[PDB]
Structure formats: C-alpha cells, structure tokens
Amino acid sequence: MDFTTTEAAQDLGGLVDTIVDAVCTPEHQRELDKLEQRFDRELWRKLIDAGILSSAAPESLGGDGFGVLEQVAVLVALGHQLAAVPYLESVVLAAGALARFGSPELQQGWGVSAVSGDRILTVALDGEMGEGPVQAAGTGHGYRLTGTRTQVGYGPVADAFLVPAETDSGAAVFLVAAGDPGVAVTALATTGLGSVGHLELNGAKVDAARRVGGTDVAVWLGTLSTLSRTAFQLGVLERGLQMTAEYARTREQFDRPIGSFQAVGQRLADGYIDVKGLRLTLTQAAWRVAEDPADIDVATAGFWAAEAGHRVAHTIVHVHGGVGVDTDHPVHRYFLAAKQTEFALGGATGQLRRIGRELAETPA
Amino acid sequence: MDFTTTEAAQDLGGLVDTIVDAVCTPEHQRELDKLEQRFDRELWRKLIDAGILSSAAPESLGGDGFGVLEQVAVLVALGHQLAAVPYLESVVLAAGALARFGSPELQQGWGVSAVSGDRILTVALDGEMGEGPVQAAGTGHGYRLTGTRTQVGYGPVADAFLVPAETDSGAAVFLVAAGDPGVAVTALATTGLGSVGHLELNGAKVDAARRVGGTDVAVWLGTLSTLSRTAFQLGVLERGLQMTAEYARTREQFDRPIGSFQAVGQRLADGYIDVKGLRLTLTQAAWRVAEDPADIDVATAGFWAAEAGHRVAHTIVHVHGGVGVDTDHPVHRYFLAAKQTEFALGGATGQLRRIGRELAETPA
Amino acid sequence: MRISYTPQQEELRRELRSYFATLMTPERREALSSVNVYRETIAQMGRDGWLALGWPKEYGGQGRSAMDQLIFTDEAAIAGAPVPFLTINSVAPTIMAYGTDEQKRFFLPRIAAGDLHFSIGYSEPGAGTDLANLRTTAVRDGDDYVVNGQKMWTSLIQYADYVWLAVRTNPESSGAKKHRGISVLIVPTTAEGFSWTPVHTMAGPDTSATYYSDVRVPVANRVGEENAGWKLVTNQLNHERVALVSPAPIFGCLREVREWAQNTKDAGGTRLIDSEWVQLNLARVHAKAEVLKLINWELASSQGPSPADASAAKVFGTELATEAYRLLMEVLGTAATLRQNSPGALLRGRVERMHRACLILTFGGGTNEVQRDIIGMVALGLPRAN
Amino acid sequence: MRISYTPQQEELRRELRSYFATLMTPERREALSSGNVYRETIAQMGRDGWLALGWPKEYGGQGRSAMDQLIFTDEAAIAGAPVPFLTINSVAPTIMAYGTDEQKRFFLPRIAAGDLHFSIGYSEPGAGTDLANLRTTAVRDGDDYVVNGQKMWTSLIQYADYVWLAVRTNPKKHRGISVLIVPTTAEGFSWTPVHTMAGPDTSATYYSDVRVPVANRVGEENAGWKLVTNQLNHERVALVSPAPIFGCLREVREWAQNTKDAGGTRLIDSEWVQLNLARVHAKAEVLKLINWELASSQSGPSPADASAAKVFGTELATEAYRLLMEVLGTAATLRQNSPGALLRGRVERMHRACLILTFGGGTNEVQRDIIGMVALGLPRA
Ligand SMILES: Cc1cc2c(cc1C)N(C[C@H](O)[C@H](O)[C@H](O)COP(=O)(O)OP(=O)(O)OC[C@H]1O[C@@H](n3cnc4c(N)ncnc43)[C@H](O)[C@@H]1O)c1[nH]c(=O)[nH]c(=O)c1N2
Ligand SMILES: Cc1cc2c(cc1C)N(C[C@H](O)[C@H](O)[C@H](O)COP(=O)(O)OP(=O)(O)OC[C@H]1O[C@@H](n3cnc4c(N)ncnc43)[C@H](O)[C@@H]1O)c1[nH]c(=O)[nH]c(=O)c1N2
C-alpha cells in the first residue's frame, strides 16, 4: 500500500501549477469572460511550449509516453485555475483513443497533430434527451452519418470530433472533421460558460478509414471521460475550498473573523472531508485504470466528484456571501465550473446507478 | 386557513398528557422493560377509566363520535411518553375499520369491545420478505386462510386481527380470532422492544360473517396506518427534541452549557425544522383524511416521520452523549421508538416511492 | 381547522393568474431580463391597485389579509413579475407606522400608484450580516443632515427616485455599537453628492454600489426618531408582514419537469418518468416543497407568528431550493446545464436559471446560520453561542 | 504507487481470516453473545502472539507496521473478536514510553500473554468531552497516594485486574493530572454495572480512600495530561474499521440477490435497492481508503486526517445501516435473538452499536474544530 503518486506526476503537476498561476490571474479570467468562445489561447500556447501536451501522450503520436496518472495530475492542476483548454477532450480522450484503437493512418495525421497542439480534437459522447443515437449507413466508399450529439466540449473550436454511431455491424466510433459536408456545429450557452457545442450530422459522409474502431472505443472513452472530469473537479474544489478558508480567516463580521464562528468551521471541515473523499477515490480509480473491471472504482470517484461538487460549490458561495456571486471577484466561477462537471457526469445519481447495476449483476 | 386543531383535540391531548406524565415515570418505564410483552396495563386502565378510548370513536361502537383529528391528538400525546398501549392498533385502525366497513354484527361485538377496552384488536398489513399474500380459499360458506403476516403490533396480546388476503373475488379483509384453529402467534424481538408478533395462518377457518369488506378496507387501513404512526412519531420526536434541548441548556462542559456551542445549536435548530415539517405535513394529511387524493398527502407526512425520525433520533443521542445510551435514563427509548416507526413506515424511501408512482401515473 | 384555500382565495388566484399572464408576456419578460419597461410595468400594477392590496384602507389600500398577500407573492413568482416588494411591504408600512404626516401624504399615494420608486440602502462593504456595523454617517447642520459614506448591493438603483438609507447619527458621541443607534433617511437620487456604479452577479440580478459625498437632506426626511431606526429596518415590532420564501418556483419547476418526463422517451423507448430513480427525485422535491407551502400558509394565517417559525421557513426554504434544483437537473440529464436562450435549452432553461438565482437567498435576508441561532434561542431556549 | 495490499500484507490478512474463523467457533461466538470465555479468548490470542503484534521488539513485540495493525483490526472486526485494544494500544505503549523499569517488567509480558486486564478510568459524570475537568483526587501520604472520587463508563471492569486511572494531583485544570495503576483488589474500590441500549455493558467505579504506592504512578506527577491525550503520539492512530459496513453490505446484497419481490423478480433488481447499496459502497470506499492512507503514511499522519477519518466513518455508519435497513423491509428491526431475524440481526445490531462512536473518542464537533484549525488554518472559535 502506497499513496505517493509518481515522480513524473508530481513534476508535471508542479509545472502546470506554476504556469496557470502565472497566466490565470483574476484579471485574465475577466478577459476570458468577454470571449464568444472561452478558450484560453495564451495558456494553451504556454502549455504546448512547456511540453505539457506531449508529456503524457503515447510515443506513437510524438509524446513522451507517460500515462493516466500523469494525465490526472495535469487535470487536477488545470482545475485549480478553471483552465479553459481542451487537454481533456483533445489529448486525453481523442488522441488517446486514436493511439489505442485507430489505424496508423488516423494516428499519424490527426493523432500527432492533437498531441502537438496544432489541431483540437474532441469527443461527442452525449445525446439530446429523448433522441436516439447517430446512425451510420454503409455506402460504397464508407459511411453516411445522420444524427446529433450535444454538450460537446470545445465543439465550436474543434478541428474534428470522435462520434459514436450505430452501424449494421453494431456500434462504432467515427472521426468527423469540422469541414466535412453535412456537419454543423452550434455554440451552446451552459452553466459553466465554457466552449461547448451541439453537433448536427445530416448525411455526413465519411470514408471507411475514418472508422476508429468498434464498441470497445465508446466504452473506453466513457470510462476515461468520467475519470478525467473527476480529476479536473478535484482541482476546482480543492482550490475553491482553500480560497473560502482564506476568506473566512479574513472577512470580519461581529468584530471577528467569520471563520471563528463554529457553524462556519463545522461546514468547512465537512468540505475538507468531501474533497478528501474525492481525492482518495480519484487516486484509487486512476491506479485501477492504469492497471488496464475498473468501471466500479471509476464510478465511485465520479459519484464523489458530483457529490462533493454540489456540497462544496454551495459552501464556497454561502460562506463568501455577496462576494461569492459578484462577477468582479473570481469566486463565482468555481461554482459554475463545479456544477457544469457535476451534471456532465450524469450527477451523483447517474454514477450510483452504474455502481448499483454492477452490485446487482455480479454475485455477492 | 387555520392550522389550530379542534377544542376537543386540545382537551383530549391535554388529558392524555396529564395521564402519561403521572403513569409513565422513569421508574415505571424500567418496570415495563422487565415484561415479556411490553403492554402497559396500568396506563391502559387509566385511559379506559378517563374515557380516552371512547372519546374519538364512532357512536355506532359506543363512542362519543369525535374523529380523526381527535385520534391524532391522542396519538401525539401518547408518543410523548412512548406509550405501550394498542390505541392505534385496536381503536384507531381495527375498530375504525369495523365501524366504517363492517356489518352491524362485527360492530356490536368486536367493535364495541375494542372501544370499551375489554378486548384488544390489531391489524396485520405486513408480509414477510420473500413471501406472498395470505390466501383465502372459499369454503363455502366461509373461508380457509393460509399465509403469514409479520411485525403485527400487539400481536402476542391481541384477541383478534384484521388480516388482508387474496380471494377469487380479489382482495378482502377478514377478522381472525387468536383462538380460531389454524392461528398461531409468535413473539418478535424488535428494535423498539415493543409487543410485536408474527402471525401464522395454516388453513384458518373463518365464517363468511368475518369478512369485513373488500379491497377498499385494505386501502383505508394502509392509509390510516401511515397517518396514525406519523402522529405517534410526532409525539416521540417533539418530546425527544424538547428533552435534548433541556439537557443542552443545563449540561455543562468547558464551564458552559453544551447548548451554547454554535455547532450544537445549529443541529438542534435543524431538528426543530424537521419536527416542524412533520407537524405541518401531519396537519395537512389529517385534515384531508377527515375531509373524506388524501393518499399522496399522507405519504408526504409518512416520509417526514421517517426522515425526521432518522435525523432527530440521532441528534437526541449524540447531543446527550453517554446519557443517551444509558438504560438508567429515559432518553434511549426515544431512539428505539423512533427507529421502529421509521421502518414500520417502509422508510423514507417507501413513502417516496408511493408519491413518485402517483406523480408518474397522473398527468402533470 | 382548514388546510386549503377558501373559495374567495381561489378566485383571487384565478384572477391573478390571468392578470399576470396578460402582464408578463414574452415580450415584456425579454425586455426586463436584458441589459421604459420596468417603470411602465410597475405603474400598470399600481393603476390596477395591486401595489396597495395589503395596505390598510385608511392609507388607500384594499385592506386584504396576509393570506391574500401570500397568494399575490406566489402568483407574481409564477409569472416572473418584478413587484417591488421591499418598497410596498417594508418602506410603505414603515412610513405608515412611524412617519410624519407630510411623509404619509406625499409618499404613500405615489408608491401605491407605482410612480415613485425606492432602493434599499442598508448594507455596506463592512456591514453585511452584521448590519449594526454600518458606518455611513449623518451629521446635523441646521435643518439638514449631511450624509457621508457608501452602501453596497443597492438594488434597482437605476430606477430609484429615493434611497431608503440606514445611517449612523451622532457619530461624534461614539455610542456603543450594541445600542444600534441608527436612523432612517429618505434621500433623493437627484441629490448633489450622490452617485452609483453597477454590480453584476452570477446569480443573475444586477445591483449596485451607492456613494454619498456630503449629501444634504432635510431633517424632515428622517423617518422615525433620531437613533431609533433599528426597529424600523429590522421589523423588530412586527409593523410588517413576515417576508416569505415562495415555494411557487420549486413547484413550477417540478410540474414542468414532471410533464416533460411523462412525454419524453429514454433510449429503450420507455417514458423517462417510468424510471424509479426519476420518480424518487420528483417525489423528494414534492414532499419537501409541501413543507415550505404549509409553513408559509401557517405564517400568513397567523397574522404575531413566532420568530422561530419565520426563521425556520426561511432556512428550510432557501436550503430546499439548492437541493430541489439539483434533483430536477439530474432528471433533465444532458439538457440540465443549458441556459435560457441557449439553443437546446429545455423548459426555457428555467431550472438552470433558478439553481443560480436561489444562491442569493441563503445568505440574504439574514444568513441561515443566524436564522438557526434564532430558532435555537427562541424555540428551544438555548443560550447564546458567541 | 500501489492502492492495494503488498504480498506480505495480503498473507497477513489471509492468515488472520483463517485464524479468527478457527478461534471464533459457533460455541465460542454463542457464549460471547450472552474465567469464562472472554478471559480465555484473550489469553488464547495472547499465547498466539497477537496482542503484542504492534509493539517494539525491545518489549517482546513483533514490531509490525501500522498497516499490519489496520489489517488486524479489520479482521478482528470481521470475526467479532473481542480484542482489548485500549490495553494493548494505549496502556502498554504508555508504560513503554513513560513507565519505570519495574512497571515495564511486571506489566508488559503479562499484558502480551493476555493474562492481565485493564480498564480505562478516565471519564467522570462531570468530565466527558472536557476530561481536564476530572475531580477524582490523589493526595500524597508517605510512599502512597490516597485516592478519592469516582469514574463513569469504566468498561470491561468485571474482567479487570487494574484500572488505568486519571487523577488530580494538583488543585491550569489540565496541568494538575497524573496517571495511577490501581488494582481492582484494592480496599475502598467498588463498581456497579451500567447497561446501554447500544449493546455493550459498562460500569461506574468508586474509590473511597484507596491506597496505592507512588511506584504505581506512570510518568511524572501532574504531567499525566500528556499521557492520557497522546500529546506526543506515543500511540498509533485509532481507526474506525469499515469492515462491518462492507460485511453488512455484502450480506444484504447476497440476500437481495436470492430473495423474490412481489412478482418473482429479485429484490435486488429494483432500482431503489441498487441506489441504496451503491451509496453504501461508494461511501464505505472512502473510509477504507482514508484509513489505508493514515496507516501507510506511518511508515506522523496529519491530526486533520485522523480527525477527518473518525468523523467520516462514525457518521457514515449511522447512514449506511439506515440504507441497508430500508432494503431489509419488514425484517429490518428484528433483533439477533428473534424468530424471523435475517443475517442474524447483524444490521439491526450495528445500527445501535455504532451510536457510541460519534460522541466517543473525541466527539465529532470537536474533531471538526481540529480539521478547521489544522487543515484550513481557521481561528479558535
Ligand atoms: C444581488 C444582491 C442584492 C441585494 C443584496 C445582496 C446581493 C448579493 N443585499 C445584501 C444582502 O442581503 C447581503 O449580502 C446580506 O444581507 C449579507 O452580507 P455579506 O454579503 O457581506 O455576507 P457576510 O460577509 O456578512 O457573511 C458571509 C457568510 O459568513 C457567515 N456568517 C456571518 N455571520 C455569521 C454568524 N453570526 N454566525 C455564523 N456564520 C456567520 C455566513 O456563512 C455568511 O453567509 C442588499 N442589501 C441592501 O441593503 N439593499 C439591497 O437591495 C440588497 N439586495
Ligand atoms: C458504552 C460506553 C463505553 C465507554 C464510554 C462511554 C460509553 C457510553 N467512555 C466515555 C465516552 O467516550 C464519553 O461519553 C465521551 O468520551 C463523552 O462524554 P459525555 O458522555 O459526558 O458527553 P458530553 O456531555 O461531554 O458531550 C455531549 C455532547 O455535547 C456536545 N459537545 C460537548 N463538548 C462540545 C464542544 N466542545 N463543542 C461542540 N459540542 C460539544 C457534543 O454533541 C457531545 O456529544 C469511556 N470513558 C472511560 O474513561 N473509559 C471507558 O472505558 C469508556 N468506555
């Protein structure tokens, strides 16, 4: 038993924290608020230049070959400052799937370009409520895809999307370029105010070589998506909680720090407990996925990301009072980011449902 | 709009309180703990002699004709001292059902007898986990009942039971005497430590005239059972909470009342809120039932009895510390009684499930 | 004993439901919820008699009950109508109870008509929950007070004709803070030395900071006696009705999500509402919102109501909102975080909108920790914790 | 990085599972669930080497890690083995750290062998969470202290050979305290039973002019506060095992898999049951993980994490046993002795047994104050 993360994870995490601390000042966050698409190009360029994208990407795509633990470390460090960059979508998920499942042809063009930061890839796992999956009809040269996918992270600024769809052979995942005919991306306005899109495929033709793989690709993407968003959530909540503690030591009412009222301390301690729970379950889940079954440990940590998310986001705001909602202060964005991820995970209940099914199906 | 109960209810509640306060001393409660069956014969006699049983019973059974509000007041007052008498089982439920649905023959013997306090009736609504309903085969003329029921209040000291059972014609409710052949009652040891039985019917013959009625009887009994247990729970929790507050006002540690630590005050306030929620929903549900749906209002209050029950019971013990578990003190029995009723209601989740079904089935 | 609306109350509900549906059209809402309409809307409600519904007949009102007022609050909440509650439920009855005759004749009918608007100037950067810490000062100079300081969170100031301003009189004496010796002044927003700057929130509403630089107002603008304003600003003697947290938005969101789940399929082709988990979420919302409805009915029918029950309702209801909108958002799935006016928003983004709007209420209106201290002391006899 | 037991930790776990299955026979379990079995059982564990597992080799122990101790605790909890933890994890190491050479030679090997039993005489009626308020006094008379007062909640006294007694040797409040070893044979010592709804019996103890040698004092006069509050961490972190929660979850889950609901569908096929069980699982995982971290990091863990684990785990128990009792339906409240009890009434038993832990071992409100001060830098309230 040993909870120390790798030396490479600690080094990456530390370097990313130095970078986001320098770049994501309170003023910088306010400037990002004015963009039509919240994508922090300055940050992204500094991360590319420092080697962050290539560090935990496969050697086949030009990376240094670190893996899931190091990706988790980067995501937690990014979360600290609500980083508006598609590390998760492009490197962890899209490039990860090309490297694991895709042809050398998909790797060497799209894969390599994602890892170098020249292109932005994303994945489109979520459907609109009440609608069925994307349908992929077989043509001569390939496929025609018809359907929609929503809540696509960085959709409006992405070069291409990995899209699950039903085929005559069963489920598969296709790479669909933003410029293919029959492809339309519509910007969405979400709680978190991030870059998010709706993807409409209206007979979008794709060549056979755009098929990344079969049903195993979507499963892997689902798992890593929960894990990765859990990591980013930890960073959001860890920093949020710390900011709130520091506020409670500073803000005085009734001639004393609000942090000296036992009601406030009790609530902030429960926050520490929630964040610690998230931290520990994320650690277990990440070690399990690195093992390479993990589904239940991942869902446990996902539950914690949603659950700590709800309680800690509310605590952050309540203890700050007016300052917690005033958009001249940085506090408010921690609530928004925590909530966007809470429901991107399907909520506490969606994650508990995946756990409960496993407990039902596998004999005790 | 008016939330104040009737003058009669206030007068009954008050009289019951003076009675249970005089009889249910801490020494008396300890004596009850030594009995094989927790049935407070001295209290029961005082209630009979004071006219409490007959006051809110129908005139057809020899009562004074007050109704559900006045029954509720009595149940809440009983709850205050964890009264070990079958008021709920015998007078509210069993006699109530004979009066509303049964033949003049069932009313004038068994009914009148329950209301005078000469016999103890109860009802057996709950089945054993994993087993089906009692089955009533047509003799005829009459019926053979085969099956079990469990968690029967006052089962081991009851003269007769109302038992729901499936017939060819559908569901019906039968009066079964403790002495009928094929009838066996086994004493159960439960969290609450109250008089509770298991009922086995092995081809128990009953005459046609023992059929109380059809499916509407079982529905009415299910509804009134939830409502009456909710009322008794309010009495348990409001007194529990008051005792805890009094303790906290006087017990000192660190040279000050434990009640002066803000953490304690916040938790006791949340306790007041929960108890108040229970009081309010009980009020609505009792008013609605007195009116004749009511079913959803009653499940809402049942949810509150289970939910407040869990939280308030725990609060009562935690804030008392060791005194809260020491059987030389009366505090512990409030936890036990709260928990017995929580699960007799099916738990918070059972009650929510009934609500959710109605919200699903009835168009919004 | 009656736990339902009377026929007359039902008729009022129907009347208000229809009234607000004609007043709060999509066009009017669009206009109010974006960066003319606000003043016209209020003047219309004034002409129609709704602003003075609850005032005594002696002061031009209809004399209606606290229950009728509750109905009005709920139906306004249902429609999104921007009723200036603090002006009509606090400013005006405070003038009625403690004002001079000249204040009564000038302000009351112009407030009732909806032609005159107030903002509440209580809070400061150093006086939020601890309002007794306010430092904005008013110094006597002839027949005027000279006012210096600043307020924070001064809402609706861009429409305001006057600030209802809490000030510290006799700053010279250094009277102990525990005496709460403040005064209330009516300050016109035309006064020289007055200015404001906008404040934006994530919760939704805009508000402001206001500033007072040697602002001169007549002593005749003081409401109540010098240093006796605390009671005015905290409703200490119950001259106002209890401020209620309406359950109507929680029930409305529940109703709309419930209806949507009845008419929408999951992957398998089943109605969404036929899932047990969805039913449990909606049920919890129902069973808890019932408490907020009932406690408010009791409070309104009680009109004093115990300060413990007023505090209980406010804590319970504002905590509940955070919980309820969460449970509902889980049901809405991939649509949950789509804001009003995003493509793909469901139910007009109402649930997402409320989950952010309700954030201000837990710490506003007396923060929930302080409310719980009140419940403990008043209802349970607990001793002071600080 | 490894979030699993090493081979050696796994073999210890495996060994203990088997050892406790063989020790806790049905005859022995029956007998403990009603000199006798309690003393014989402890003497057997002592002979088998388990009582000194965690002690330094210098004092006859095996010198094993905090992780090994955690494993021991868990497997004892799984078996219901009545390990005298306070005697072996607090009394003994306090003697090791602050005792005279004579105390060390007499007490340590008799404790390790399981032949000598202690009770902890800290609390009094007026000194619970505020232990520094204790008033039981010890006054010097020649080579003896003369002890007068009373203790409350003095557990396991009926088997005790000695009381580990906190006394006031000076009438700040925290600075006037010493620890005395007091034989239960002493003249002027008596006790009366205290029964609890939670399950375990305990006692009140009384000390009427009780004489004990000054040689029975452990540490320096008036320096006993340090001893009794583990101020210098001479003891390992007290852990709240998750093993009973996971055990109950497992048993309920199996039962729900093998039992029909209305219709002949398995009980576990209900979505509500799955959500209850999932919640138990997901939360019990945190208790498992935080304890693993605490133990593997003593290879000091933050006082904040120790407090966090204790609050989280003692609160979790009250929530978990509720959720499992919902699943058990009409069987939930059946106690262990009862006809119809399911799973031997284990879940019902645990829902009452866990009540003492929220206020015991430093009450949760205080534990949260520590987290706030230590982890979050909050000021004294
Ligand atoms: C959008 C908007 C709109 C308005 C207002 C605010 C905002 C955000 N308000 C003022 C609002 O009502 C104000 O925020 C509160 O009244 C509280 O003050 P602070 O925000 O400074 O929180 P403050 O710093 O006082 O408190 C922050 C937190 O500290 C803790 N705390 C404080 N005291 C405590 C105690 N005694 N015990 C335990 N914990 C304690 C609580 O967690 C509390 O929530 C206002 N005002 C006005 O004058 N006119 C107006 O129109 C409006 N409208
Ligand atoms: C069955 C059993 C067995 C044992 C013991 C008890 C019991 C019930 N104990 C003692 C037990 O650990 C003890 O009850 C606690 O250490 C607390 O003391 P009180 O019961 O007096 O509660 P106390 O009256 O101190 O506390 C009651 C409540 O008040 C609140 N409170 C108190 N202080 C507070 C603060 N600072 N801030 C906020 N809230 C506060 C908390 O809610 C707390 O639970 C013991 N002792 C011993 O010497 N030897 C033994 O063997 C045992 N074993």
| Number of independent structural domains in chain D | 3
Task: Provide Rg for chain C, Cα atoms.
Answer: 22
Pairing of strands A142-153, B196-207: unpaired
Rounded to the nearest 10°, the torsion over CA D291, D294, D299, D301 is: -170
Beta bridge partners of A160: A121, A177
Take residue A122 and report the two structure tokens written for it. Answer: 């994303």
CATH class of B222-364: mainly alpha
D-interface mutation test, from B37, B148, B152, B191, most D Cβ less than 10 A away: B191
Residue D33, SS3 per DSSP:
coil
C240 among known catalytic residues: yes
Report which bound ligand comes closest to the CA of D119: 2
Residue D194, SS3 per DSSP:
strand
Of residues A133, A151, A317, nearest to C334 (C-beta): A151
C182 and C233 in contact (C-beta within 8 Å)? Answer: yes
Phi-psi category of residue C187: left, alpha or beta, with phi > 0 → left and psi -120 to 50 → alpha: beta
Q: How far apart are the first and last CA of chain D?
A: 39
A169 and A208 in contact (C-beta within 8 Å)? Answer: no
A24 and A81 in contact (C-beta within 8 Å)? Answer: yes
Task: For residue D196, give how far its alpha carbon lies from the nearest alpha carbon of chain B (Å).
Answer: 5
Q: Tell me the CB-side half-sphere exposure of residue D17, using CA atoms within 13 A.
A: 7
Judged by CB atoms closer than 8 Å, whether chains meet at A273 and D312 is answered as yes
C325 and B25 in contact (C-beta within 8 Å)? Answer: no
Which candidate, D366, A14, A314, places its Cα nearest to that of B253? D366
> Looking at this protein, which amino acid is placed at residue C129?
T
Take residue D104 and report the two structure tokens written for it. Answer: 């060390």
Q: What is the DSSP letter of A326?
A: B
> Looking at this protein, which amino acid is placed at residue C366?
G
How many angstroms separate the CA atoms of D75 and D14, rounded? 9
Last residue of a domain, one of C176, C210, C225: C225
C130 and A253 in contact (C-beta within 8 Å)? Answer: yes
Topology (CATH) of B121-221 = Butyryl-CoA Dehydrogenase, subunit A; domain 2 (2.40.110)
Q: Where are the extended beta strands (E) located within chain C?
A: 118-121, 137-141, 144-152, 162-169, 182-188, 194-199, 207-218, 222-223
Same domain, D280 and D244: yes
Residue A177, SS3 per DSSP:
strand
Same domain, C29 and C68: yes
How many angstroms separate the CA atoms of D68 and D76, rounded? 12
C155 lines ligand 1 (CB under 6 A): yes
Q: Tell me the CB-side half-sphere exposure of residue C266, using CA atoms within 13 A.
A: 14
> Looking at this protein, which amino acid is placed at residue C146?
V
**Mutational pocket test of ligand 1: of A243, A253, A325, the residue with most ligand atoms within 8 Å of the beta carbon:** A253
Q: Other CB atoms closer than 10 Å to residue D133's CB: what's the count?
A: 17
Beta bridge partners of D289: none
Selected residues 190-229 of chain A with any CB under 8 Å from a CB in chain D: none
Beta bridge partners of D119: D163
Judged by CB atoms closer than 8 Å, whether chains meet at B129 and D318 is answered as no
C118 lines ligand 1 (CB under 6 A): no
D327 and D252 in contact (C-beta within 8 Å)? Answer: yes
Same domain, D179 and D49: no
Q: What is the DSSP letter of B119?
A: S
Catalytic residue among C226, C240, C330, C352: C240
A117 is in an annotated binding site: no
How many angstroms separate the CA atoms of A363 and D256, rounded? 10
Alpha-helix runs per DSSP H in C181-306: 230-233, 248-262, 276-301
List residues in chain C that are followed by a break over 2.5 Å (C to N): 35, 303
Q: What is the DSSP letter of D166?
A: E
Take residue B162 and report the two structure tokens written for it. Answer: 């109302």
Contacts of A37 (CB under 8 A, 6+ apart): A156, A157, A187, A195
Take residue D252 and report the two structure tokens written for it. Answer: 């309920």
Residue the block writes with tokens 């007050």: B66
A120 and A114 in contact (C-beta within 8 Å)? Answer: yes
Question: What phi and psi, each to the nearest 5 degrees, are found at residue C382?
Answer: -75, 150
Beta bridge partners of C146: C139, C216
Report which bound ligand comes closest to the CA of D121: 2
Residue C386, SS3 per DSSP:
coil
Last residue of a domain, one of C76, C99, C114: C114
A263 and B263 in contact (C-beta within 8 Å)? Answer: yes
Phi-psi category of residue B48: left, alpha or beta, with phi > 0 → left and psi -120 to 50 → alpha: alpha
Measured CA to CA in angstroms, residue B79 lies from B22, B151, D323 at distances of 15, 19, 25
Which candidate, D10, D20, D86, places its Cα nearest to that of D50? D20
CA angle D309, D312, D317 (to 5 degrees): 120
Take residue A307 and report the two structure tokens written for it. Answer: 């659950």
Residue the block writes with tokens 């789509």: C338
Q: What is the DSSP letter of C157?
A: G
Return the exposure string of D195-234: e unless at least 16 CB atoms fall within 10 Å of the residue's CB, then b. bbbbeeebbbbbbeebbbeeebbbbebebbbbbbeeeeee
Take residue D305 and report the two structure tokens written for it. Answer: 């994490």
Same domain, C21 and C163: no
Q: Which positions in chain A touch C333 (Cβ < 8 Å)?
A: 129, 343, 346
C230 and C178 in contact (C-beta within 8 Å)? Answer: no
How many angstroms separate the CA atoms of A76 and A13, rounded? 8
Which candidate, A106, A209, A204, A219, places its Cα nearest to that of A164? A219
Q: Other CB atoms closer than 10 Å to residue D299's CB: what's the count?
A: 9
CATH number at residue C85: 1.10.540.10
H/E run at residue B363:
none
Last residue of a domain, one of C57, C87, C114: C114
Measured CA to CA in angstroms, residue D182 lies from A219, B46, D91, D235 at distances of 65, 52, 13, 22
Q: Where are the extended beta strands (E) located within chain A?
A: 121-123, 135-138, 142-153, 160-167, 170-177, 183-187, 196-207, 211-213, 252-253, 256-257
B337 and B82 in contact (C-beta within 8 Å)? Answer: yes
Each domain of chain B, given as residue ranges in start order, spans 2-120, 121-221, 222-364
Task: For residue B190, give how far its alpha carbon lies from the nearest alpha carbon of chain D (Å).
Answer: 5
List residues in chain D that are followed by a break over 2.5 Å (C to N): 34, 171, 299
- SS3 breakdown of chain B: % helix, strand, coil, rounded to 5? 60, 15, 25
Same domain, C287 and C373: yes
Residue the block writes with tokens 């007055």: C194
A329 is in an annotated binding site: no
**What residues make up the domain containing C26?**
2-114
How many angstroms separate the CA atoms of D146 and C45, rounded? 85
C274 and C372 in contact (C-beta within 8 Å)? Answer: no
Pairing of strands C137-141, C162-169: parallel
D280 and D323 in contact (C-beta within 8 Å)? Answer: yes
How many angstroms separate the CA atoms of A272 and D311, rounded? 11
D264 exposed, middle or buried (CB, 10 Å; 0-12, 13-18, 19+)?
exposed
Question: What phi and psi, each to the nearest 5 degrees, are found at residue B315?
Answer: -60, -45
Take residue B25 and report the two structure tokens written for it. Answer: 């001393």
Same domain, C251 and C370: yes
How many angstroms separate the CA atoms of C259 and C247, rounded? 18
Contacts of D129 (CB under 8 A, 6+ apart): B253, B254, B321, D359, D362, D363, D366
Residue the block writes with tokens 């994501």: A24
How many angstroms separate the CA atoms of C86 and B244, rounded? 38
How many angstroms separate the CA atoms of B229 and B305, rounded? 8
CATH number at residue D177: 2.40.110.10
Cα D358 to ligand 2 centroid, rounded to whole Å: 9
C248 and C74 in contact (C-beta within 8 Å)? Answer: yes
Phi-psi category of residue B70: left, alpha or beta, with phi > 0 → left and psi -120 to 50 → alpha: alpha
Same domain, D110 and D60: yes
Same domain, C212 and C305: no
What is the SS3 string spanning B313-352?
HHHHHHHHHHHHCECCCCHHHHHHHHHHHHHHCCHHHHHH
Q: Which positions in chain C touch B245 (Cβ < 8 Å)?
A: 380-382
Beta bridge partners of C212: C149, C194
How many angstroms separate the CA atoms of C289 and C247, rounded? 6
Which candidate, C107, C372, C67, C111, places its Cα nearest to that of C241? C67
Q: How far apart are the first and last CA of chain C?
A: 41
B-interface mutation test, from C1, C318, C368, C373, most B Cβ less than 10 A away: C1
Same domain, D77 and D95: yes
> Looking at this protein, which amino acid is placed at residue C31?
A
Cα D202 to ligand 2 centroid, rounded to whole Å: 14
C125 and C135 in contact (C-beta within 8 Å)? Answer: no
DSSP string of C51-112, one letter each residue: TTTTS-GGGTS----HHHHHHHHHHHHHHT----HHIIIIIHHHHHHH--HHHHHHHHHHHH
C369 and B266 in contact (C-beta within 8 Å)? Answer: yes
Q: Which positions in chain D touch C280 (Cβ < 8 Å)?
A: 272, 275
> Looking at this protein, which amino acid is placed at residue D164?
W
Pairing of strands C118-121, C162-169: parallel
> Looking at this protein, which amino acid is placed at residue A275?
V
Q: What is the DSSP letter of D55?
A: S
Take residue A125 and report the two structure tokens written for it. Answer: 């796992």
> Looking at this protein, which amino acid is placed at residue C26?
P
Same domain, D247 and D363: yes
D120 and D64 in contact (C-beta within 8 Å)? Answer: no
Q: What is the DSSP letter of B289?
A: H
Residues in chain B: 364
Same domain, C385 and C237: yes
How many angstroms separate the CA atoms of B72 and B290, rounded? 11
A304 and A264 in contact (C-beta within 8 Å)? Answer: no
Selected residues 121-140 of chain A with any CB under 8 Å from a CB in chain C: 126-130, 132-133
Chains B–D, number of C-beta pairs less than 8 Å apart: 122
How many angstroms separate the CA atoms of B112 and B106, rounded? 9
How many angstroms separate the CA atoms of B137 and C91, rounded? 74
Take residue B26 and report the two structure tokens written for it. Answer: 């801490």
Residues in chain C: 386
H/E run at residue B185:
strand B183-187
Judged by CB atoms closer than 8 Å, whether chains meet at A325 and C359 is answered as yes
Instruction: For domain A2-120, give the CATH number.
Output: 1.10.540.10
How many angstroms separate the CA atoms of B338 and B296, rounded? 22
Same domain, C82 and C145: no
Question: What phi and psi, each to the nearest 5 degrees, are found at residue C279?
Answer: -60, -45
How many angstroms separate the CA atoms of A238 and A230, rounded? 12
Residue the block writes with tokens 């409350």: D152
All partners of chain C with 3 or more CB pairs under 8 angstroms: A, B, D
D282 and D323 in contact (C-beta within 8 Å)? Answer: no
Pairing of strands A142-153, A183-187: unpaired
CATH number at residue D226: 1.20.140.10
Measured CA to CA in angstroms, residue B36 lies from B151, B196, B335 at distances of 16, 11, 21
DSSP string of A238-276, one letter each residue: HHHHHHHHHHHHH-EETTEEGGGSHHHHHHHHHHHHHHH
Cα A44 to ligand 1 centroid, rounded to whole Å: 38
Residue B262 touches partner A, C-beta closer than 8 Å: yes
Residue the block writes with tokens 């497997």: D75
Phi-psi category of residue D108: left, alpha or beta, with phi > 0 → left and psi -120 to 50 → alpha: alpha
Pairing of strands D137-141, D118-121: unpaired
Judged by CB atoms closer than 8 Å, whether chains meet at A266 and B261 is answered as no
Phi-psi category of residue C214: left, alpha or beta, with phi > 0 → left and psi -120 to 50 → alpha: left
